[model samples]
Target: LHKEPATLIKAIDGDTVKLMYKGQPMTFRLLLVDIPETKHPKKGVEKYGPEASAFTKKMVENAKKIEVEFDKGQRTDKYGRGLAYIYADGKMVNEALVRQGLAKVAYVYKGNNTHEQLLRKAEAQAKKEKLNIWS
Candidate 1:
């Protein structure tokens, strides 16, 4: 795992964000979680997209600090956005999103087997509780 300190610059949508990493601007896609699209040229906004985006924004704002960790392999997406697991306020941001039912576990990569299992469990719990998007 590659770890780096970052400051969240903005939430572009539910699953994407811009951050400042070591004084350089970087865009990152949250690893192993796919939130609804707030805006898409073709598909447009999806269900619960706004709520997901709001949830992410609030979490970032409430976080005391932010750090990003990259998987051992496949660091970037096809568009060159870094793929990362974000930690904020001593909590895993990806897992929090899944637990809240704001996002779904997705694209389980090889290096993140443990995290994938945890996220799946979180998703199942959220689904059972009928939280937010699950509702």
Candidate 2:
């Protein structure tokens, strides 16, 4: 795994963010999580898309510090965006998104399977509580 200090440049959606990594702009797609599509021009906005984007914006933008940790395996998607587990204010932002029902655990990396399980548990809890998108 690799760790990098980052600044939240923008929230593309609930699960994708733009960051400044060592003074270079990069896209980081939150690993193991997926949220509604808010920026698909053809598909348009999906259900709860705006809310998810707003929630992510609030969480990442308001954080005191943001760090991105890449999985030991593949580090980028087919589109070349960085695949990472984001930490904001000392918590895993990907897990927080799932736990709060803004996102669901959707993908798994071989190097990060344990985190996938944790995210699944968080999703279960969010579903049980009927929070946000899970409602």
Candidate 3:
């Protein structure tokens, strides 16, 4: 019914965080935002990995407030990570990264796009302006 509060243990990459909202430590991946491959074995650290990690780390580590809102359709990914929109203070990390071109909207299930419109708009806007990975 509501968002859950969390503290950031680490910004694992551009679209993932290690967190603890209550009992167990959790891995929450932004529902639809996939930034660069910071830790991909085959991909290695990608070209966009640097700035992308910088933003997420700064946003997550430096935020005074933190919380997560889950989507209704599917709650977790195949990895069992919480697929939620991580909000750092006022920033919704999912859409914000898309707006910044650190994340392009991908890997969406049919019913899990709670913020589809916003995500799409941000993608279009960032695409038009030529930001980060968009370039």
Candidate 4:
């Protein structure tokens, strides 16, 4: 019904996170950021995929605090992973991922448009600078 504090189980990938919310183990796919796959069956591993994963891990390990915000409208994605925004160390992880060009702002819908504008702004900035994915 509202945002809840969660404990990190691990960082699954650049865009996926594992956490214990309300003592229940849940794997969340971060909203608004689509990261390149490090374990794709077809691509195997895309260029910069490792960098994205490493960056995500570094952030997760260094984040002194973390929490998850699940919207009341819809709780999960079509792929079954919990869909939500990630908060860590007083900042929004979703935007941070895009800010670095490690992820792209994607999967738009009215229900999941909470941080759409800011993420798109970040995306453009990253694109202008030709960061990671943009490069």
Candidate 5:
């Protein structure tokens, strides 16, 4: 787990970020949810491609003091970075991304699994309202 000194850094792409905690550089893979690959061979850009990336950037770019939580499963992904849930001002940025349609709910491994329904609700709302990338 890490602490955020500022809002999370913008999402570089579909699976990279530049975050800071305690004045130290902390980067990780967003656990669970996966967005359509902006630059991948197996998948083409999905419905709200650019919009998803942009929304993710906005949320992290506009917040302060982030709290990063980790799941007790496989530590790092194939990229060798820690996996974590980023929270800002008592809000889960990951869930926010889903709720707003910038990301989808992803479940990999176990633990820290307390908000599946909440995330689903958010996703549904995003789809219904045509929020952000959902449209």
Candidate 6:
């Protein structure tokens, strides 16, 4: 396809970053995913913390074409740009991280209600499987 929904430029820690889509700059939240903190004050380093970052980098790679899904509120955060759900290969990358146990769901901007139930189910399965950071 000549047009891709979105493109990623950086991973920017675990939560946010700058991306370009349809000839415009956009910032997106990983959506319902929280990996171990790269800089935590009280929590310190979480389990598989560094690995989680590395995994995200590998998955996103820099400057790669990606897909974007918009929630009901979808327009930038307070800063003003755009808020979207990023995907790769038809898979919700953010949710995948939570499902794999490398991250946890964060209720940001009323997270995709339709997918929340499945996301939580995936998290439970990840916990039971003792995958990634969950162990």
Off by over 4 Å in 1: 110-114
Clashes of each: 0, 0, 0, 0, 1, 1
Tens digits of lDDT, candidate 3, 15-65? 779998787799987887777768886876898888888888899999998
Clashing residue pairs found in predicted model 6? 76-82
Against the reference, the lDDT scores of all candidates come to 0.85, 0.86, 0.85, 0.83, 0.67, 0.69
Which structure among the candidates has the greatest TM-score?
3
Top candidate on lDDT is: 2
Task: Tell me the tens digit of each residue's lDDT in model 4 across 1-135.
Answer: 356688889898888889888889988988878888796868768877888888888787788888788854577868778988888886888888899988898877448787789899999999999998899
User: Of the candidates numbered 2 and 3, which has the greater TM-score value?
Assistant: 3
Instruction: Put down candidate 1 lDDT per residue, 1-135, tens digits, no spaces.
Output: 556789989878778888998899999889999878877878868988998888788888788799998877787878989888888876888899999999999977656554788899999999999998889
Please give the lDDT score for candidate 1: 0.85
For every candidate, C-alpha RMSD to the true structure in Å: 1.6, 1.7, 1.4, 1.7, 3.2, 3.5
Model 2 lDDT per residue over 1-135, tens place: 556789988888888899999899999988998888787868868888888888788989899899998877788889889988999887898888888898888857656564778889999999999998878
TM-score of candidate 1 against the unseen true structure: 0.91
In Å, residue 121's CA in model 6 sits off its true spot by: 1.6
User: Against the true structure, what is each candidate's TM-score?
Assistant: 0.91, 0.90, 0.92, 0.91, 0.72, 0.78
TM-score for candidate 3, please give it. Answer: 0.92
Candidate 4, residue 12: CA error in Å?
A: 1.0
Q: Please report, as a residue range, the 10-residue window in candidate 2 with the lowest summed lDDT.
A: 107-116
Worst 10 residues of 6 by lDDT: 1-10
